[PDB]
């Protein structure tokens, strides 16, 4: 029987036993009888009718109409008539890109955004800073451009890699995303992930090293900013003010994953600061660091987000954290509920799209394989009902880019698993099935070829070649 191939699967589809050979939009109304994020699309032999509860629902309805037009373009016999009534399961449906590890030019970001909007993603998270590069310009700190935005090579390849966005480019990105229903979330990791910052501004750190260079390999850095130094707090105030100007979401992801604190332990300034504050250890110092940063953000009307660490203690009720450790999803759901935290599911078992998608593709000596079928197994609530897991805001898939040097590589690992993530964030469990998703994705190969000039076919051997190992 003839059906639609819309991804994500709509919450309700009622097909009729007639065929439509045109999708001309005959009516387009806003009505109070639909939620602001909801739409109803009626496909008739004469054309389509769209009703929506608000601008957001209208964006989604037009995205569904776009997919139906692609299907009809491939089906000259027509597509079924029917009524689609639709609204998302979760309000947060996100992808993260990592320009700190490999810079993503503006044009390439635009293509990435168009593709994620096709699948009704509504959050774009930018990992802007890390050991391997710093991509956010900050007035008054020119060495961020001249030093921190450049590295000499990647993994011994002898090829320099550099880049930094302009403020104007980032405001363009924000407007481009907004027009496509997407909010943009910056991430500035602190106090660690800061080898590039140290290369530019060694005076911000407990043990300044003028010979420090921007990192060209993966691994953990012990270089933490020294919370006793006034230049650090002036710098981060400047950072947060730039983010306030550029990013209207007002959300600032601070990282927050466990950092090595050996250098704080040894720092003569931090040692005496801990003694004055009767702090027992460097974890108490970390709690104080994040309380101070959260206060700076609050003075700005901004709110922090974190990669969840169950035993961190740096969170205040109402904040939002990301669940990411394998095997910890259900525990994190329970713990955040008890702690009054909101939770975004980014479990690396399902959502870390830097991992290879077919067994035998490059795993860089450590990555597990996450197939499309495994990815589609994701239920963000892990079996818990809406009344017990209402603090779960949605789903988020990071495409970490240590080993993804350009858009071609990035999209190879992001898609088609991002389509599965989109359906996990949008579609109620009652309309989800691997067999239906697999059928639709088969059709989407042609849809994406025609609309984006991009090939989503995946075989063990057709990943683009790498220069490393
Ligand atoms: Zn220190």
Curated annotation (Swiss-Prot):
Q: How is its activity regulated?
A: Significantly inhibited by the addition of sodium dodecyl sulfate (SDS), but not by EDTA, urea, 2-mercaptoethanol or Triton X-100. Strongly inhibited by Cu2(+) ions, in case of which the activity is decreased by 70%. No significant inhibition with Al(3+), Fe(3+), Ca(2+), Cd(2+), Mg(2+), Mn(2+), Ni(2+) and Zn(2+) ions. Strongly inhibited by PugNAc (O-(2-acetamido-2-deoxy-D-glucopyranosylideneamino) N-phenylcarbamate) in the sub-micromolar concentration range. PugNAc at a concentration of 0.5 mM decreases the activity by 50% and the addition of 1 mM PugNAc fully inhibits the enzyme.
EC number(s) on record? 3.2.1.52
Residues bound to Zn(2+) are 206, 226, 267, 270
Q: Which Pfam families match?
A: Glyco_hydro_20 (PF00728), Glyco_hydro_20b (PF02838)
Provide this UniProt record's keywords sorted from A to Z: Carbohydrate metabolism, Glycosidase, Hydrolase, Metal-binding, Polysaccharide degradation, Signal, Zinc
The enzyme's main class, written as a single word, is hydrolase
Which residue pairs form cystines in this protein? none
Q: How does activity depend on pH?
A: Optimum pH is 5.0. The activity drops sharply below pH 4.5 and above pH 5.5.
Q: Which residues form the active site?
A: 130 (charge relay system), 193 (charge relay system), 258 (charge relay system)
Q: Which residues bind substrate?
A: 101, 257, 324, 352-354, 400-402
Reactions it catalyzes: Hydrolysis of terminal non-reducing N-acetyl-D-hexosamine residues in N-acetyl-beta-D-hexosaminides
The UniProt entry's GO CC annotations, sorted and at most eight, read: membrane
Annotated thermal dependence: Optimum temperature is 37 degrees Celsius. Retains more than 90% of activity after 96 hours of incubation at 37 degrees Celsius and after 12 hours of incubation at 42 degrees Celsius.
What are the recorded GO MF terms, alphabetically? beta-N-acetylgalactosaminidase activity; beta-N-acetylglucosaminidase activity; metal ion binding
Tell me, which GO biological process terms does this entry list?
A: chitobiose catabolic process; glycosaminoglycan metabolic process; polysaccharide catabolic process
Q: Give the record's family classification.
A: Belongs to the glycosyl hydrolase 20 family.
**Biological role stated in the UniProt entry:** Hydrolyzes terminal GlcNAc residues from terminally unbranched N-glycans and from chitobiose. Hydrolyzes beta-1,6-linked N-acetylglucosamine and beta-1,4-linked N-acetylgalactosamine from pNP-alpha-GalNAc[beta1,3Gal]beta1,6GlcNAc and pNP-beta-GlcNAc-beta1,4-GalNAc substrates, respectively, as well as beta-1,2-linked N-acetylglucosamine units from the non-reducing end of N-glycans. Hydrolyzes GlcNAc residues linked to alpha1,3- or alpha1,6-mannose branch, but has low activity on substrates with more than one GlcNAc residue on one of the mannose branches.
Instruction: Specify the protein name.
Output: Beta-hexosaminidase Amuc_2018
